Amino acid sequence: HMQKVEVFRIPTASPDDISGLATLIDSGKINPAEIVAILGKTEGNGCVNDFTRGFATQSLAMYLAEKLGISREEVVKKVAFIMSGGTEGVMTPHITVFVRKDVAAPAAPGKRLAVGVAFTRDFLPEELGRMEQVNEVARAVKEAMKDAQIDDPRDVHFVQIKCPLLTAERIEDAKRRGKDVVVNDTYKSMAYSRGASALGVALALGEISADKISNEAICHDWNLYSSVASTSAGVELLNDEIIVVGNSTNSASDLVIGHSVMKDAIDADAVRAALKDAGIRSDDEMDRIVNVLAKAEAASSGTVRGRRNTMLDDSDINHTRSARAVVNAVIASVVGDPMVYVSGGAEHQGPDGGGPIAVIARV
Amino acid sequence: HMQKVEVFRIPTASPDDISGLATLIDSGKINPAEIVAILGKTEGNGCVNDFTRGFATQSLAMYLAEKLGISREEVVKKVAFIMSGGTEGVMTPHITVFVRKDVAAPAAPGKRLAVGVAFTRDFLPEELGRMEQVNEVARAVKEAMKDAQIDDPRDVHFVQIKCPLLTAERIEDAKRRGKDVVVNDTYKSMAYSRGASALGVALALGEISADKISNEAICHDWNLYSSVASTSAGVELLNDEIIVVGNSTNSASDLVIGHSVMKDAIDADAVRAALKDAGIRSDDEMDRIVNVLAKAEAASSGTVRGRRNTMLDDSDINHTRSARAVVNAVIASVVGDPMVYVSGGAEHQGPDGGGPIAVIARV
Amino acid sequence: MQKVEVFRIPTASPDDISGLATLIDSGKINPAEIVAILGKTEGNGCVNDFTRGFATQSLAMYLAEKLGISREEVVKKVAFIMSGGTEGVMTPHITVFVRKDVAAPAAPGKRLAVGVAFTRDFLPEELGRMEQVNEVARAVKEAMKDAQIDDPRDVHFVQIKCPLLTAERIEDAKRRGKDVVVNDTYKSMAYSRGASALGVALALGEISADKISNEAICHDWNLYSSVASTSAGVELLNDEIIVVGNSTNSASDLVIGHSVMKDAIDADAVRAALKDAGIRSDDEMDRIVNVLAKAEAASSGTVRGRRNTMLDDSDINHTRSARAVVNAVIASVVGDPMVYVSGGAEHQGPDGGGPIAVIARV
Amino acid sequence: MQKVEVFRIPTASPDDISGLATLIDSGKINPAEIVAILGKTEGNGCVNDFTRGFATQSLAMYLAEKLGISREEVVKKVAFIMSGGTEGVMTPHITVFVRKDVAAPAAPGKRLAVGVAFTRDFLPEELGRMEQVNEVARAVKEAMKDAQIDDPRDVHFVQIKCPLLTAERIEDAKRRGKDVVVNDTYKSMAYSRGASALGVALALGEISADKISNEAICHDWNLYSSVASTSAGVELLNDEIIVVGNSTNSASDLVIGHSVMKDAIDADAVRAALKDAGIRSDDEMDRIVNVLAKAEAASSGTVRGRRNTMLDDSDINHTRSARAVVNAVIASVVGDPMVYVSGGAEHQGPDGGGPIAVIARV
Ligand SMILES: [Ca+2]
Ligand SMILES: [Ca+2]
Ligand SMILES: [Ca+2]
Ligand SMILES: [Ca+2]
Ligand SMILES: [Cl-]
């Protein structure tokens, strides 16, 4: 069972811009029936009140439903739509479209890019940031691995998740139902949803043993983390959507993925290590990049390499916005291109203050 | 001898503007040795990273030290400096200067304005938002009442407090010392400091019995509140400073204070009730206003009179900023003047979504 | 006979159509008779506010599918004016205008009437200039006819959506060798709003044409309309006009009245607008359908002699602050923060003030 | 013979003088030899940033008390340039310049030299206009003399603090019958920065006087200085100038070099500036005293053909975003986010770029 994955990084002019995707479909380069996932950077604030994420998904679902002659509801059941808000600094809004199809092809000369998709059930507000979310995410990650035809967790290089958050109305509704939520704070709820989801990845991949994970460890024990999880929260969904990206011997793709882990927000060495892991060994081979995907965050200590910063004290600009600008700038300075995927808030994703970074590259 | 309190509401051009106070001192209207407290609205963001509060205090302490021929340290030991940041909407930056004269003259008939000042000990970071802060504030409020020569809590109409907050550096240092702080969030720490301080007022005044107050109730049980507490947090101090304002039979002041409680952020009726309680019975009598002092906040329900608002969901503008703009605008529309004191974050200060409102008026 | 019905509907998010769908499914609203929807959407109300477009897309998709027509036809048939920015306590909502033909006598006197017109698309270099003024003026007169209002004194509110400049549009104009009115995205909203407002004043006879030139736009604050309400967005390239007034040829059980806020804290003008709409005492406040107002920071940096930081605050843009203030003032008078307040009142009321209208049940 | 010593000191808050006090109390700094302090302070770096003034007041009060002189005399003697905005990972700090007269001989080649000069106060209506250009140019020449630098090729960084407009100052100008360069407080910072930078270019011969006019300021991006670094603030009414370069008549154990970032992600220019200061490999990075750079949003709204939102974002002003980006780029090259990055680079390097200098131990 050979599958071919193709990946298209498409600049966008606004959250609702489908024109670049339409161009690739109209020219025959993309059969829209073979799209399995779209990962976006959308130009809202990336925090609670970011409606560019939902706007982008609605616009893509409308377009694809009408191209395929099916309902928007069926498109959303069939295709993962993960919109990561926040395009701070020089970060360029874009979408990354994953196309997958069965092919009649012989055995790869090694392992090549593979992608799998799985969705969880919807969560009650009082399940976010708790073991209910951890365990359901872990189940879905294992399902997505099977979908990708990856049996060895060491061949998984990036697990991208969209997960829910709490709004004031959802917290108050939980209160009226007699239920207490993990945190009575809309912005901080994103951290708990991101972190519980990341711990689900680590559980599913065997990066952390189950006996170490409990409600009390979530967003507290930073010794527990996944080296490939990348999680992103939004008002526009009530479940978790999972994209597993790795390499498989059952892949006929002309692409590979590699990764490293940024030890902190300015770790350009880790960017170069991720490039090398994807087969890019010199600046001359940089044109083989399809995209770079990374997590960024403010370290809980309030410092980087012992130097204070204000990210956790700044009441005007939220810390995930600042972290995204910084890490996108670092990556852009290495690869010469700010149109790369950077997502903020890296709870249990790499060490405290760091985050996984993956590169999808042409062979 | 006999206390006489005079109160001067002075517009400012910037946080460091001492010119209006200097004009009143140079004219002989204010003897600087008789200043006991200054309550400011300063034009920073009113949140964690607001340095206009400390800048204003430093500028006033420098100026008064040089006028009095004493050290800045002595001025700060002797005079309360309470700088409430955040001048959103049309709210006009200003300071309110409290002068206490000792006069060999009769008391005025009835009860007239009286002011008392007390400072607590410094608090360790791990004490903010907990019973150590509640109980020490209650002790100091009783001391300030004695300083004001008010022996009946019913004659206390406004208790204004400045209290500390947590920064990322202070939280990390607490962690290094093996201590758990009340909340691992700088902005939310302001709410816990404000709320514990307000409960200390309620305890001291007999508004709430001690047996109802515990660490678990702080910033949770909104049935517990003071009807006169007004608390404000800042990076620029490590203790609580307290100004008790009320009326005393042993006073020669030509001023009185009255108050009410806003039931919600748009309760103009409560503004008019506070004016009436201070002897202002018609629009023509509003020229007797010296200042209006009020607390404002976002209700935990995310609504006002059943109508949703975004204050608790908005990741760009923090909720205390929004609440200050709203309540200042409401008061300004009643009294015709936006140069009034409005402070945001009213945990245990009036009901959830409301806050105390006092008026100092000429007789 | 014309009969206008108006529904103020709370929304849970920019894309929330549930309240409108409830009214349609119950038979209160025939979707074919909707002529305009005026929204407050919870984005920042400035340049990078996509809640306006998200709301319009969601409503157009819902109505297109209910009516069995294309979204393109819906947007030609219905004015969608989405005013972003729900600061302070201001409650997100939509106001739906329904116009029916009824076989009943016109009501005594004058009753609510509405008209809609659209302009052509504008080139970036036309925004904030006489091209926009004159084309809006033509559309306003067209919308007056649509409303069957002959006397401009019977127009009480003219709501407009107009375009703005983004960095990409400015750069494209540069590449084409064309200078724009201002090389500033946020300020371009002011020029678009102001030129559109002067178009209203021109069409209504509030200001004679000889007084208006490119040089006076966003400069001569003596020139203003007392009924114009303009709002800018990235989501359109033309101007959309809703004229609201009263006509003798109307059978609506609603009326509209208005006043002008002299400044951002002018509660007296709120009460005057209520009275102009027939609400003369507090106990009649439940006859409000909605209140619609413009708010702005005064160029002097003061209100009633008192400084504020609106024009100096680099964190929060001045139209956000003005909306929070004026919504709070109105809410404190009427007891309800779910009213329409739009910021940036260039040539709309005096400098620092803005028109305020009340649609009320008779 | 002049010897310049430079101390980069982390700060805990805008008013933190403890690190400087420690260097004085240990005998490493004689406070009477301080000639300039260049700070990064943690306010927003825009109009309503009072951390800059708070930092200057705190340092002037500390130094006045240590020296037994008045604060007023300290401010007449020492340049205090506080650049607000510490976005991203940028670490608040101050850089203290100490100049000693020493009997030592002629150190081989050229070594670090510093000079200081102040302009007169400007009226608000003078900001962004030729009067500011010309007065700054005269002060830059005076500062070069103070530094004992006669050749403009030996000037590597000219750091300036300059004024801005607030609403109150604009109203003052209007009351006096004057118009200001722009009726926009945030944009006024760009005009003050840009006019000041053109004054540097004029003084250094980087542009000819006949090419500079009021109309060119903040419009002709072909006119720029490759060493000017300008920063605006509410806390002063004049321009303060620090010229940093190398002189044959210097005994400093430090040198300065520079390059120009072509855009906000130009790490090659960071490396070039390091190499120009004698740092030839990653293992010599420990010789850095500080890195000083200008950052800005390009007028095109793009970096290397890729769109960004810096000029469209109504929540976060573009100089805040540019500072975060360029500090992150420099930090990733040198391994330390405690470097000086200032935003808004009008006529400082190309459009979208800015000068970058390195002070390094020999
Ligand atoms: Ca992490
Ligand atoms: Ca309260
Ligand atoms: Ca106006
Ligand atoms: Ca430049
Ligand atoms: Cl109570």
Author numbering:
A (entry chain C), B (entry chain B): 0 to 283, 289 to 367
C (entry chain D), D (entry chain A): 1 to 283, 289 to 367
The authors write:
The use of cyanuric acid hydrolase to solve this societal problem is being explored and the best candidate for this biotechnological application is the thermostable enzyme from Moorella thermoacetica. Consistent with the “Toblerone fold” observed for these enzymes, the RMCAH monomer is composed of three concatenated, highly divergent, but structurally homologous domains, which endows the enzyme monomer an internal pseudo-three-fold symmetry (Domains 1, 2). As observed for AtzD and ACAH, the active site of RMCAH lies on the pseudo-three-fold axis within each monomer and is formed by similar sets of residues from all three domains. As observed for ACAH and AtzD, each of the three serine γO atoms is in close proximity to a lysine residue (Lys40, Lys161 and Lys299), generating three pairs of Ser-Lys dyads each from one of the three isostructural domains from the same monomer.
The X-ray crystal structure of the engineered Moorella cyanuric acid hydrolase was determined by molecular replacement and refined to 1.51 Å resolution. All four monomers within the RMCAH tetramer showed clear electron density for a bound ligand in the active site, regardless of whether or not substrate/inhibitor was added during crystallization. The ligand was readily interpreted as malonate, which is a major component of tascimate used in the crystallization condition, and no residual mFo-DFc density was left after further refinement. All four MLA molecules adopt a staggered conformation, in contrast to the planar/eclipsed conformation seen in AtzF. The top-view of MLA shows that the MLA-protein interactions mimic the substrate analogue barbiturate (BAR)-protein interactions at A and B carbonyl-binding sites. The forth oxygen atom is far out of the plane, occupying the position D, (position D) and roughly points to the center of the triangle formed by Ser (83, 231 and 347) γO atoms and is within hydrogen-bonding distance from all three Ser γO atoms. The triangle formed by the three Ser (83, 231 and 347) γO atoms is slightly expanded compared to that in structures with the position D unoccupied. The electron density map clearly reveals one metal ion bound in domain 3 of each monomer in the MLA bound crystals, interacting with the δO of Glu301 carboxyl group, one water molecule, and the carbonyl oxygen atoms of Ala350, Gln353, Pro355, and Gly358. The octahedral coordination is consistent with the presence of Ca2+ in this site.
